[PDB]
Amino acid sequence: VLIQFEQLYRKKPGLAITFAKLPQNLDKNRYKDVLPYDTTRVLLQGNEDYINASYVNMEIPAANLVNKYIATQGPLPHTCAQFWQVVWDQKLSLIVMLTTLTERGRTKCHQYWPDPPDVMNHGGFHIQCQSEDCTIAYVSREMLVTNTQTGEEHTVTHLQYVAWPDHGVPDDSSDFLEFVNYVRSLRVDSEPVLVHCSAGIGRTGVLVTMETAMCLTERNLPIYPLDIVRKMRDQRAMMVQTSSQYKFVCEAILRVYEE
């Protein structure tokens, strides 16, 4: 289990990564080594089409189910406009953020939403935070996004998980599992859920894996985490980054089963 994960490829052989490496796009990547594949990267309309974001879709035909995601990095100060453009273009209603802005004195994410009652403007979108409600492990916010060119409004639910430790992984998986079940509760139809952490591969991969395992468990279907991970990595490289993360995922999967 914890040995074949380490043997598994990080990037799918043959899959080109070219746009992410273009000189004009380099400072739009948070981490120089975490890049979207050309084939699954999200495209922006405009003269510069690039964001470090990937479409990641998890098919479970044995449940007549497809769970769509957009996996992305924490936006940078100069990529917030693009982040909100993706949210707008895809009319996404749920953003899941798996980090605090800083962890052990290191920046992980730019604050791309306002603290109420402030507002922000990014790429011609006005953002207002209508509500902010905390639980022990996470914060739920309702965002009103206004396209300043058209006056059109869109409501977006923003979930931020704040309890992940600055080192390693949660000692007790309960709160994270509750969070994933809340995310599942808000998922719509075949509408992607935007998920990000700092690079959009580690905690993001853990989340996608656990939602997938929960869907499988619910319909009494077999769960092979190494398959689930490979499937994600064919769509965004390096997802589920560390053995500690993979080990965490596995034990959690056995908990939900046994509980």
Author numbering: 646 to 904
Text taken from the publication that reported this structure:
Protein tyrosine phosphatases (PTPs) play a critical role in regulating cellular functions by selectively dephosphorylating their substrates. The ∼280 residue PTP catalytic domain consists of an α/β structure, and biochemical and structural studies have led to a detailed understanding of the catalytic mechanism (Barford et al., 1994; Zhang, 2002). Key features of the domain include the PTP signature motif, the mobile Trp-Pro-Asp “WPD” loop that in the closed conformation positions the conserved and catalytically important aspartate residue, and the phosphotyrosine recognition loop. Here we report the crystal structures of 22 PTP domains, including two tandem-domain RPTP structures and a detailed structural comparison of this protein family.
In the fourth category, both the gateway and secondary pocket are blocked and the inaccessible binding cavity harbors an aromatic residue or a proline in position of Arg24. The second-site loop assumes a twisted conformation in these phosphatases. This architecture is present in the subgroups NT5 (PTPH1, MEG1), NT6 (PTPD1, PTPD2), R1 (CD45), R2B (RPTPμ, RPTPκ, RPTPρ), and R4 (RPTPα, RPTPɛ). PTPs with particularly high enzymatic activity against generic substrates were RPTPσ and PTP subgroups R5, R3, NT1, NT2, NT3, NT4, and NT5. The subgroups NT1, NT2, NT3, and NT5 exhibited a pronounced preference for acidic residues N-terminal to the phosphorylation site.
